Amino acid sequence: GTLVASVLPATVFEDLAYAELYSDPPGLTPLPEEAPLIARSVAKRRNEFITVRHCARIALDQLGVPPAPILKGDKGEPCWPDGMVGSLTHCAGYRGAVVGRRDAVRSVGIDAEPHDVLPNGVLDAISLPAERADMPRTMPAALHWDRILFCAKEATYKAWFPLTKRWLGFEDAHITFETDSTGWTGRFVSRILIDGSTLSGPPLTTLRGRWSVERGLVLTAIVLLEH
Numbered sequence: 001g002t003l004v005a006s007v008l009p010a011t012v013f014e015d016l017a018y019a020e021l022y023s024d025p026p027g028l029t030p031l032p033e034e035a036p037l038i039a040r041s042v043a044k045r046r047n048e049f050i051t052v053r054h055c056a057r058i059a060l061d062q063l064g065v066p067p068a069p070i071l072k073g074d075k076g077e078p079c080w081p082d083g084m085v086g087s088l089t090h091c092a093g094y095r096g097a098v099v100g101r102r103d104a105v106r107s108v109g110i111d112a113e114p115h116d117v118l119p120n121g122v123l124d125a126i127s128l129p130a131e132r133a134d135m136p137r138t139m140p141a142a143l144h145w146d147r148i149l150f151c152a153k154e155a156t157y158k159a160w161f162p163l164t165k166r167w168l169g170f171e172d173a174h175i176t177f178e179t180d181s182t183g184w185t186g187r188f189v190s191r192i193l194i195d196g197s198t199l200s201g202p203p204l205t206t207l208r209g210r211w212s213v214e215r216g217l218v219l220t221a222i223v224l225l226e227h
């Protein structure tokens, strides 16, 4: 239950919490207030939705937030409790939540991916030329740098959207990577190439994150601090 800790910072760790699961536990019914969000959904969506919301409430509870419904807002963003921020993700074999206190943490974005190739047609749609040239030179050959780049792009959108309420395209952020000498973890910086105007606080120009590959999964997390 600690895979996502591999991408969280020590700077604000006291004001963060996380919860993850690797399958959908039986006997979970949706909260009534949340059931409308999946009323028309296929079973696989209904089950992961319920599991991921379960993780969110577990993590929120660790920070002293009483369990409650988490509704869906502008463009599908989760509606966190007052004073809280967070991000949610699922893929085959992963469901996870990371949350933080807004006094310490301005935004969170996470993503989980299978550590598998992407098709070369999806690569150009999700990358800049500079990323396709640079990431090979910064990442050991054993890693699926196409998939890790994509994971970081998704973490970037999720950290961005709640602060801007604007689209961020695959071509609107240039992501540069570093690999730790261990070769399965590292850091990235997402450089925003468009207007970074936010609803409050300073504009978004650069979002720093972490990445990890373990147990056939990529994880990324961005944790923007309140300054």
Ligand SMILES: CC(C)(COP(=O)(O)OP(=O)(O)OC[C@H]1O[C@@H](n2cnc3c(N)ncnc32)[C@H](O)[C@@H]1OP(=O)(O)O)[C@@H](O)C(=O)NCCC(=O)NCCS
Pocket (backbone or CB within 6 Å): 049, 052, 074, 075, 076, 077, 078, 087, 088, 089, 090, 091, 110, 111, 112, 153, 154, 156, 157, 158, 159, 161, 162, 168, 169, 170, 171, 172, 173
């Ligand atoms: C929205 C998106 C990022 C979700 O990622 P995903 O890999 O499809 O799915 P994940 O399981 O990792 O994430 C899903 C969760 O993201 C969260 N999410 C959805 N829309 C969101 C938004 N606008 N802002 C923040 N979080 C959002 C939700 O909690 C959702 O799960 P829920 O519906 O169960 O609440 C993705 O589907 C998408 O639309 N991407 C396009 C935007 C983009 O990536 N731009 C590139 C920026 S450099």
